[PDB]
Amino acid sequence: SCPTHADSLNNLANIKREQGNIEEAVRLYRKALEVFPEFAAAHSNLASVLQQQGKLQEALMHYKEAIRISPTFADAYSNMGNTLKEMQDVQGALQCYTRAIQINPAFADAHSNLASIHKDSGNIPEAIASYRTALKLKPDFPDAYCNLAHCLQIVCDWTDYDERMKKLVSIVADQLEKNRLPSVHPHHSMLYPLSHGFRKAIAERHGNLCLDKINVLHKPPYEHPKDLKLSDGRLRVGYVSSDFGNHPTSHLMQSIPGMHNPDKFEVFCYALSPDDGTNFRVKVMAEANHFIDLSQIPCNGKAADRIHQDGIHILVNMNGYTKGARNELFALRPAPIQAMWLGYPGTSGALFMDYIITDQETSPAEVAEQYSEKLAYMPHTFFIGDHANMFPHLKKKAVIDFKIYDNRIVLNGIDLKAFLDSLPDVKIVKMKCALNMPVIPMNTIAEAVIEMINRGQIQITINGFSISNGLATTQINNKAATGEEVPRTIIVTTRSQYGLPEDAIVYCNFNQLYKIDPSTLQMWANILKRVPNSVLWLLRFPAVGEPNIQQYAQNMGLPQNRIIFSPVAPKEEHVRRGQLADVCLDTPLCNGHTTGMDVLWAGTPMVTMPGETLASRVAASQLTCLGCLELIAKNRQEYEDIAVKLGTDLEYLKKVRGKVWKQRISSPLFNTKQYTMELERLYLQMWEHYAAGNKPDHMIK
Ligand SMILES: O=c1ccn([C@@H]2O[C@H](COP(=O)(O)OP(=O)(O)O)[C@@H](O)[C@H]2O)c(=O)[nH]1
């Protein structure tokens, strides 16, 4: 019952904790509490190691004790908050934060945590405010600084940008050198000028967080299959994602599990999130050989057991370091071969991952040192899209002529042909080097369509055919607006709907604004200045970034009307309105990935400049697969030149649009059947290699 004794125990456990011996520390803390139970400091310490080990429910118990013993303990309130946050009790976490701030107005950590809550809930201006307050109270505060840095990045606040990037590097450099966990998230490292080494290290450090959380389970190594006998000659492939539902990932690969060859493969889909009722989740469950809902097995131990009992040979990680990931499953290694795929544009940096599925364009062998996994190449690009299936109505288009452009007033529809054949005089414009663009002339009918658009009407009727206003698809068929269903009506899309000029080159970029940096905007200003008859089309993504971007745009000499903003739209509208643009200017810092497949499906030429990171090379990979090497810039000047040519030489622009318009169908880019077959071949290399007794090595065909 001696406090001086218990205190000595506490001091000793801190020692064991800094040596990285988490397990012995817990034993010492527990000894201190057995001696002197009213020991606030011991409860608080034991709580944060229990939190590290993912034993949240029990850590919460000890934080509460620490609070009862010392009601002035703002540090304990703030930590207990983090625990509740991790338990998905954000209401209770918020209470813990504000209460710490009430007790100690100058307690920086609580302000930083309060900010994070806002940052997660999309309230960026509020998060930015609380971070700034935390930094005023505690100027040397890496976590706060780096998160604020990301907030500023999100809304395009480039105040002291150059100096900011320099301090981020200095922070990561100092933390890595002192063997601490870097304040920069692995997913965000792709945005800052860190060395390839630093990025991988960050990733690794983060991957190790899973280890304390699984070591606690005390699980033995799993015995993996050495053959395919128990699976009747079938390779068992497990796809693990928290995004089987209305999420970009499903928009890319939902068709794949059903395209696997049942003779050689047995597809197991492991959902980390619960059913959201969308068709995406419905399709994958219906076409996968087995669909397992792991969201109902919260214990990573019991969940990995499930995977192992299914007998998976190749386990595929589609989350990496994104929201909803449960990499503890991979840390446990329930499969002999575990690969990174599609969902995360980076390296896990962790031992528990063997391959990263990619291609020679995205990840050339000379930069194989930015990954920790062995490279596994797909023949063309590793990127795939399900556009051919989700938006087949965009396979053909038709225009209306107002005195011929291919992107001023556009009609799409599965029944578009039958409607045209009902019209009196339709001119059929040929595309050279089997393809044509029907042109509806300015008639009484063509006037009624314009009319519906100008008056903001939902829809009209022409010769019994249903003509829909592209702005109101969600009132006509919400499932069709989200991409879950193919539209059953003919849709009209115009530049007037979005305030785009009818007589100008339209450069577009439909990415989140965080992908844009000062150097990129400067590049785009140079283009707009060299092509005076043009505008830049961007999205309010988020809206608060618009005033910031516009502000810098005018510092570069661009009048307001040069950049035109639109609101974020439903999937189908988003993809469809891409048809309106003449050219898409890709962001070099982090390319449009899904967004890249989007603009390409509309037959819109995309100009890109491949960097060194995987994230910055996906666009070029897409383009080479498509067959457009002349849209790939080697440097900033060639990028600006390529865009200035497409903008000023109208025949060259017509020729390239015609290329993308044809090749998006003829190339293997949107071919999910071929892609799946290539993927299967890649798997079999992986398996043959492992069965032959070898350890993972690069897979270049
Ligand atoms: O106006 C828009 C703009 C974007 N998107 C969708 O939002 C997602 C963007 O997510 P992400 O930032 O991850 O795109 P990526 O980085 O993969 O290109 C994509 O599915 C787009 O199709 C949309 O539905 N409407």
Coordinates of N, CA, C and O in Angstrom, one line a residue, residues 597-673:
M597 N -9.6 7.8 -65.6 CA -10.5 6.8 -66.3 C -11.8 7.5 -66.7 O -12.4 7.2 -67.8
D598 N -12.3 8.4 -65.9 CA -13.5 9.1 -66.1 C -13.4 9.9 -67.4 O -14.2 9.8 -68.3
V599 N -12.5 10.9 -67.4 CA -12.3 11.8 -68.6 C -12.0 11.0 -69.9 O -12.5 11.4 -70.9
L600 N -11.3 9.9 -69.8 CA -11.0 9.1 -70.9 C -12.2 8.4 -71.6 O -12.3 8.3 -72.8
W601 N -13.1 8.0 -70.7 CA -14.3 7.3 -71.2 C -15.2 8.3 -72.0 O -15.9 7.8 -72.9
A602 N -15.1 9.6 -71.7 CA -15.8 10.6 -72.5 C -15.1 10.9 -73.8 O -15.6 11.7 -74.6
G603 N -14.0 10.3 -74.0 CA -13.2 10.5 -75.2 C -12.5 11.9 -75.2 O -12.4 12.6 -76.2
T604 N -12.1 12.3 -74.0 CA -11.4 13.5 -73.8 C -9.9 13.3 -73.6 O -9.5 12.7 -72.7
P605 N -9.1 13.9 -74.5 CA -7.7 13.8 -74.4 C -7.1 14.4 -73.1 O -7.5 15.5 -72.7
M606 N -6.3 13.6 -72.5 CA -5.7 14.1 -71.2 C -4.2 14.3 -71.3 O -3.5 13.4 -71.8
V607 N -3.7 15.5 -71.0 CA -2.3 15.8 -71.0 C -1.7 15.6 -69.6 O -2.2 16.1 -68.6
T608 N -0.5 14.9 -69.5 CA 0.1 14.6 -68.2 C 1.6 14.6 -68.2 O 2.2 14.4 -69.3
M609 N 2.2 14.8 -67.1 CA 3.6 14.8 -66.9 C 4.0 13.9 -65.8 O 4.0 14.2 -64.6
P610 N 4.5 12.6 -66.1 CA 4.8 11.6 -65.2 C 6.0 12.0 -64.2 O 7.0 12.5 -64.7
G611 N 5.7 11.8 -62.9 CA 6.8 12.1 -61.9 C 7.6 10.9 -61.6 O 7.8 10.0 -62.4
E612 N 8.0 10.8 -60.3 CA 8.7 9.7 -59.8 C 7.9 8.7 -59.0 O 8.0 7.5 -59.0
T613 N 7.0 9.3 -58.2 CA 6.0 8.5 -57.3 C 5.0 7.8 -58.2 O 4.7 8.2 -59.3
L614 N 4.6 6.7 -57.7 CA 3.5 5.9 -58.3 C 2.3 6.8 -58.6 O 1.8 6.8 -59.7
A615 N 1.9 7.5 -57.6 CA 0.7 8.4 -57.7 C 0.8 9.4 -58.9 O -0.2 9.8 -59.5
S616 N 2.0 9.7 -59.3 CA 2.2 10.7 -60.3 C 2.5 10.1 -61.7 O 2.8 10.9 -62.6
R617 N 2.4 8.8 -61.8 CA 2.7 8.1 -63.0 C 1.5 7.3 -63.6 O 1.6 6.7 -64.7
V618 N 0.5 7.2 -62.8 CA -0.7 6.4 -63.2 C -1.3 6.9 -64.5 O -1.7 6.2 -65.4
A619 N -1.4 8.3 -64.7 CA -2.0 8.9 -65.9 C -1.3 8.5 -67.1 O -1.9 8.1 -68.1
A620 N 0.1 8.6 -67.1 CA 0.9 8.2 -68.2 C 0.7 6.7 -68.5 O 0.6 6.3 -69.7
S621 N 0.6 5.9 -67.5 CA 0.4 4.5 -67.7 C -0.9 4.2 -68.4 O -1.0 3.4 -69.3
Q622 N -2.0 4.9 -68.0 CA -3.3 4.9 -68.7 C -3.2 5.2 -70.1 O -3.7 4.6 -71.0
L623 N -2.5 6.3 -70.4 CA -2.3 6.8 -71.8 C -1.6 5.9 -72.7 O -1.9 5.7 -73.9
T624 N -0.5 5.4 -72.2 CA 0.3 4.4 -73.1 C -0.6 3.2 -73.4 O -0.5 2.7 -74.5
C625 N -1.3 2.7 -72.4 CA -2.2 1.6 -72.6 C -3.2 1.9 -73.7 O -3.6 1.1 -74.6
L626 N -3.8 3.1 -73.6 CA -4.8 3.6 -74.6 C -4.1 3.7 -76.0 O -4.7 3.3 -76.9
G627 N -2.9 4.2 -76.0 CA -2.2 4.4 -77.3 C -2.0 5.8 -77.7 O -2.0 6.1 -78.9
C628 N -1.7 6.7 -76.7 CA -1.5 8.1 -76.9 C -0.2 8.6 -76.3 O -0.3 9.4 -75.3
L629 N 0.9 8.3 -76.9 CA 2.2 8.7 -76.3 C 2.5 10.2 -76.5 O 3.4 10.7 -75.8
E630 N 1.7 10.8 -77.4 CA 1.9 12.2 -77.7 C 1.2 13.1 -76.7 O 1.2 14.4 -76.9
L631 N 0.6 12.6 -75.7 CA -0.1 13.3 -74.7 C 0.7 13.3 -73.4 O 0.3 13.8 -72.3
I632 N 1.9 12.7 -73.4 CA 2.7 12.5 -72.3 C 4.0 13.4 -72.3 O 4.8 13.2 -73.2
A633 N 4.0 14.3 -71.4 CA 5.1 15.3 -71.4 C 6.3 14.9 -70.6 O 6.2 14.3 -69.5
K634 N 7.5 15.2 -71.1 CA 8.7 14.8 -70.4 C 9.1 15.9 -69.3 O 9.8 15.6 -68.4
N635 N 8.6 17.1 -69.5 CA 8.9 18.2 -68.6 C 7.8 19.3 -68.7 O 6.9 19.2 -69.5
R636 N 7.9 20.3 -67.8 CA 6.9 21.3 -67.8 C 6.7 22.0 -69.1 O 5.5 22.2 -69.6
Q637 N 7.8 22.3 -69.8 CA 7.7 23.0 -71.1 C 6.9 22.2 -72.2 O 6.1 22.8 -72.9
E638 N 7.2 20.9 -72.2 CA 6.6 20.0 -73.2 C 5.1 19.8 -72.9 O 4.3 19.7 -73.7
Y639 N 4.8 19.9 -71.6 CA 3.4 19.8 -71.1 C 2.6 21.0 -71.6 O 1.6 20.9 -72.2
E640 N 3.2 22.2 -71.3 CA 2.5 23.5 -71.8 C 2.4 23.5 -73.3 O 1.4 23.9 -73.8
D641 N 3.4 23.1 -74.0 CA 3.4 23.1 -75.5 C 2.3 22.1 -76.0 O 1.6 22.5 -76.9
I642 N 2.2 20.9 -75.4 CA 1.2 19.9 -75.9 C -0.2 20.4 -75.7 O -1.0 20.2 -76.6
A643 N -0.4 21.1 -74.6 CA -1.8 21.7 -74.4 C -2.1 22.9 -75.2 O -3.2 23.1 -75.7
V644 N -1.0 23.7 -75.5 CA -1.2 24.9 -76.3 C -1.5 24.5 -77.8 O -2.1 25.2 -78.5
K645 N -0.9 23.4 -78.2 CA -1.2 22.9 -79.6 C -2.6 22.4 -79.8 O -3.3 22.7 -80.7
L646 N -3.0 21.5 -78.8 CA -4.4 21.0 -78.9 C -5.4 22.1 -78.8 O -6.5 22.0 -79.3
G647 N -5.0 23.3 -78.2 CA -5.9 24.4 -78.1 C -6.0 25.3 -79.3 O -7.0 26.0 -79.5
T648 N -4.9 25.4 -80.0 CA -4.8 26.3 -81.1 C -4.9 25.6 -82.5 O -5.4 26.2 -83.5
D649 N -4.4 24.4 -82.6 CA -4.5 23.7 -83.9 C -5.7 22.8 -83.9 O -5.7 21.7 -83.3
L650 N -6.8 23.2 -84.5 CA -8.1 22.6 -84.4 C -8.2 21.2 -85.1 O -9.0 20.4 -84.7
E651 N -7.4 21.0 -86.2 CA -7.4 19.7 -86.8 C -6.6 18.7 -86.0 O -7.0 17.5 -85.9
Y652 N -5.6 19.2 -85.4 CA -4.8 18.3 -84.5 C -5.6 17.9 -83.3 O -5.6 16.7 -82.9
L653 N -6.4 18.8 -82.7 CA -7.3 18.5 -81.6 C -8.4 17.5 -82.1 O -8.7 16.6 -81.3
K654 N -8.9 17.7 -83.3 CA -9.9 16.8 -83.8 C -9.4 15.4 -84.0 O -10.1 14.4 -83.8
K655 N -8.1 15.4 -84.4 CA -7.5 14.1 -84.7 C -7.2 13.3 -83.4 O -7.4 12.1 -83.4
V656 N -6.9 14.0 -82.4 CA -6.5 13.4 -81.1 C -7.8 12.9 -80.4 O -7.9 11.8 -79.8
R657 N -8.8 13.8 -80.4 CA -10.1 13.4 -79.8 C -10.6 12.2 -80.5 O -11.1 11.2 -79.8
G658 N -10.5 12.1 -81.8 CA -10.9 10.9 -82.5 C -10.1 9.7 -82.2 O -10.7 8.6 -82.2
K659 N -8.9 9.9 -81.7 CA -8.0 8.8 -81.3 C -8.5 8.2 -80.0 O -8.9 7.0 -80.0
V660 N -8.6 9.0 -79.0 CA -9.1 8.6 -77.7 C -10.5 8.0 -77.7 O -10.8 7.1 -77.1
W661 N -11.3 8.7 -78.6 CA -12.7 8.2 -78.8 C -12.8 6.8 -79.3 O -13.7 6.1 -78.9
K662 N -11.9 6.4 -80.2 CA -11.9 5.1 -80.7 C -11.1 4.1 -79.8 O -11.6 3.0 -79.6
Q663 N -9.9 4.5 -79.4 CA -9.1 3.6 -78.7 C -9.6 3.2 -77.3 O -9.2 2.2 -76.7
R664 N -10.4 4.0 -76.7 CA -11.0 3.7 -75.4 C -11.8 2.4 -75.5 O -12.0 1.8 -74.4
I665 N -12.2 2.1 -76.7 CA -12.9 0.8 -76.9 C -12.0 -0.3 -77.5 O -12.1 -1.4 -77.2
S666 N -11.1 0.1 -78.3 CA -10.2 -0.8 -79.1 C -9.0 -1.3 -78.3 O -8.5 -2.4 -78.5
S667 N -8.5 -0.4 -77.4 CA -7.4 -0.7 -76.6 C -7.8 -1.6 -75.4 O -9.0 -1.8 -75.3
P668 N -6.9 -2.1 -74.6 CA -7.3 -2.9 -73.5 C -7.6 -2.1 -72.2 O -7.7 -2.7 -71.1
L669 N -7.6 -0.8 -72.3 CA -7.8 0.1 -71.1 C -9.0 -0.2 -70.3 O -9.0 -0.3 -69.1
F670 N -10.2 -0.2 -71.0 CA -11.4 -0.5 -70.3 C -12.0 -1.9 -70.6 O -13.1 -2.2 -70.4
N671 N -11.1 -2.8 -70.9 CA -11.4 -4.2 -71.2 C -11.2 -5.1 -69.9 O -10.2 -5.6 -69.7
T672 N -12.3 -5.2 -69.1 CA -12.2 -5.9 -67.8 C -12.0 -7.4 -68.0 O -11.5 -8.0 -67.1
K673 N -12.5 -7.9 -69.1 CA -12.3 -9.4 -69.4 C -10.8 -9.7 -69.6 O -10.3 -10.6 -69.0

